[PDB]
Write a protein that binds this ligand. Structure first.
Ligand code: SF4
Ligand code: SF4
Ligand code: SF4
Ligand code: SF4
Lengths: 444, 418
């Protein structure tokens, strides 16, 4: 008979010995965040469908408006009617409610404050003194259990811990000056170094973002997207599950930072800022890096968002996992064949970046992310076709052969989504048991 | 979904009222009224109730307790429970988000960062492309589930349950002075295009036909520790879930071409709205009891002119079960819950007279909160419909505290949305 799926058993089967899995050489240096395709001047501007060059997201807005007017849910994808096209973009737009400028990247601004002191919740609770009282627990084992429990309350579907590898922290952040209001933020972005110094608490000066040398650990969360909606990529409902999960990421960061602070430690939130989430996720054991560039997890494949919190709280690092992703990506190449911009390489991994958007000096599949971003104005969304077609995004990829777990090699419209299955936060009760957690799962 | 169809009743508010019913001023609640707001701490110092409760939390942590006369495993465990409680409230203002059109509860989306970022698309300025209440009901309920509701229902807006006057603050008062500068402000209905606040009035349009009610499920293991700290923590986390639900859903409704008023614990009486929208039935303890969660579920609501199909009220025997049960009343640590029958006359200023209900003494309830250092919840914990702290911390958990053993019960297809 079919063995009842056991996600915890799967993770124990593929656990590695300690050690960062990312292979590097001497040319590796920390990466300036301005180099990402979203921010770099070489890629930030894209033509709209009339050929006008604009910031990428404004050209993409022009295409969303055109599609609604034409009763479309995506590029050359007719909707049931104009009302349905409108509803998908209303859902997408609303999903972003708790996110600043598509990613919350500015450190120590808006939702991403590096201290809790000014938050309305901290002020309300100040008479209890939780953020001022020294820690009552310093045992990393108990702290790992407490913080992971808090993380699940805070909306993480996956959580892991790693020692902080500074190679993946941006050398300089993209941010705005402290006196600039929101309405001018996109006009006034600047660079600001992220440095490590012998200081007691995370602190920002006029010149630097200063992370203390005691900032030992990073906690990485996986926030699961909805499979039915992502499978509509590159159309509007894939944009909506993306958007809602960015607001879930924000809530997670603030909730968890506040818990850590109220435990007597400091905590730095980040969402899409501060450093490279995929690298942290691999080092924390959530999954393995893939050909498309994303972290593939056993539970969700790549159909999961990442965020992370940095802290001096003593914790037990998790072990990395190797469930064969590298070898499957070597022979699969489905994302590369289906990518509408041919951004994903069909070749082998190298240490040499394809362009300024890649960090050289680490062995990885080198993709052209300017080509990726170029398809977003064309399609009026955030694509996601690579995630949608990845075999690991399918549910029930795992089978048991009587001895051990293995991957099933055989695996290698929008009206119906609106009328079909949904549940709280887009989670799927057919698979939600996979992320149940007991103390045995949280700390060893 | 089969159970809910089996117990659907014919249309009509199931709350029985008489000719004495008047709308209720929010300042009368035990949290805000001057006769109940102040309570002594354990040293005998009279303070605002929540500050006296803070003193008890501090005392408990120092003494290694998770609750009144409940020893923790150690001081570290005691500290962790209160840290989790305090963190849970991150997205909530002054225990409930009650001030309308302040902080997270804005009545227009125009000034929000998300609306400003999306302004070039014009979704909030474009007339609706859908006016069909059937299609709108399916769209908005799908959105409500994305926004974190475990249950969602629609009712026509009964103004009897809208507060006659809200508790709020002046618009330009900063957060740090909010608690000391609370004021009362009328909520009125007028022929105006959009919800609007003047110096004198909170104005809801006469076109505000409907209320969308969400149920936000709490964690059963944690609530079972009532009145101790982990019950407080699931309470707190769900208040922040409520706030995010209201903002997400209001934005979706605005981007569909309609207006939307968030509320959380403000604007009107959630239990009455939830009963009229079919989420559950009112109970002896005073809560809406649902089939899926019993009373172990939080409520929020959004008011809108979006055309919608109202849901049917449900009757699965709660009234007859409460008539003979009395378990919450016997376990209540403050004897706040009556063992008598339902009447139309409130016991004190804190109750709204003129509706048939079990009349409870809610100042007695609030008095227990500084003594126990929490938000109690024993009545919810012991209710048959709802079915140590080290074991909770070491035990089962899942995303947002939801339980995969029961999560299938809230799956939704179009069939059950409209
Ligand atoms: S589609 Fe295939 S090659 Fe691409 S990430 Fe998924 S498994 Fe790897
Ligand atoms: S998001 Fe789309 S364009 Fe970008 S890499 Fe994936 S498939 Fe290609
Ligand atoms: S404990 Fe008994 S009387 Fe009280 S609300 Fe629950 S069922 Fe009704
Ligand atoms: S919360 Fe506690 S004190 Fe209040 S009515 Fe319920 S059992 Fe009684």
């Amino acid at each position: 008979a079919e063995k009842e799926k056991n996600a915890a058993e799967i993770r124990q089967q593929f656990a590695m010995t300690a050690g960062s899995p990312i292979i590097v050489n001497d040319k590796l240096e920390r990466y300036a965040e301005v180099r990402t395709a979203f921010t770099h001047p070489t890629s930030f501007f894209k033509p709209n469908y009339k050929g006008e060059v604009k910031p990428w997201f404004l050209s993409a807005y022009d295409e969303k408006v055109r599609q609604i007017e034409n009763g479309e849910n995506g590029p050359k994808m007719k909707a049931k009617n104009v009302g349905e096209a409108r509803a998908g973009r209303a859902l997408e737009a609303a999903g972003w409610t708790l996110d600043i400028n598509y990613g919350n990247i500015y450190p120590n601004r808006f939702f991403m404050l590096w201290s809790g002191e000014t938050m309305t919740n901290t002020q309300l609770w100040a008479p209890v003194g939780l953020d001022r009282r020294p820690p009552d627990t310093t045992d990393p084992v108990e702290l790992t259990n407490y913080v992971k429990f808090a993380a699940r309350m805070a909306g993480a579907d996956l959580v892991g811990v790693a020692r902080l590898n500074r190679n993946w922290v941006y050398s300089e952040a993209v941010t705005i000056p402290a006196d600039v209001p929101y309405e001018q933020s996109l006009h006034k972005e600047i660079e600001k170094p992220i440095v490590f110094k012998d200081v007691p608490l995370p602190i920002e000066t006029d010149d630097e973002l200063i992370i203390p040398n005691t900032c030992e650990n990073v906690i990485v969360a996986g926030i699961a997207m909805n499979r039915e909606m992502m499978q509509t990529a590159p159309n509007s409902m894939a944009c909506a599950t993306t958007a809602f999960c960015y607001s879930r990421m924000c809530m997670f960061d603030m909730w968890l930072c506040q818990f850590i602070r109220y435990m007597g430690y400091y905590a730095i939130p980040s969402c899409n800022g501060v450093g490279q989430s995929v690298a942290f996720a691999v080092e924390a054991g959530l999954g393995q890096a893939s050909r498309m560039g994303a972290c593939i997890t056993p539970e969700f494949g790549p159909n999961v968002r990442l965020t992370k919190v940095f802290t001096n709280m003593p914790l037990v690092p998790d072990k990395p996992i190797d469930f064969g992703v590298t070898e499957f990506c070597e022979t699969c190449k489905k994302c590369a064949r289906e990518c509408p911009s041919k951004a994903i390489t069909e070749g082998p991994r190298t240490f040499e970046g394809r362009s300024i958007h890649n960090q050289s000096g680490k062995l990885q599949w080198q993709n052209d992310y300017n080509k990726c971003l170029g398809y977003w104005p064309e399609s009026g969304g955030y694509c996601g076709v690579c995630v949608a077609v990845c075999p690991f995004t399918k549910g029930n990829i795992w089978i048991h052969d009587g001895v051990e777990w293995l991957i099933d090699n055989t695996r290698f419209n929008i009206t119906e989504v609106w009328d079909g299955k949904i549940n709280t936060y887009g989670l799927d009760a057919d698979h939600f048991r996979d992320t149940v957690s007991f103390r045995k799962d949280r700390v060893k």
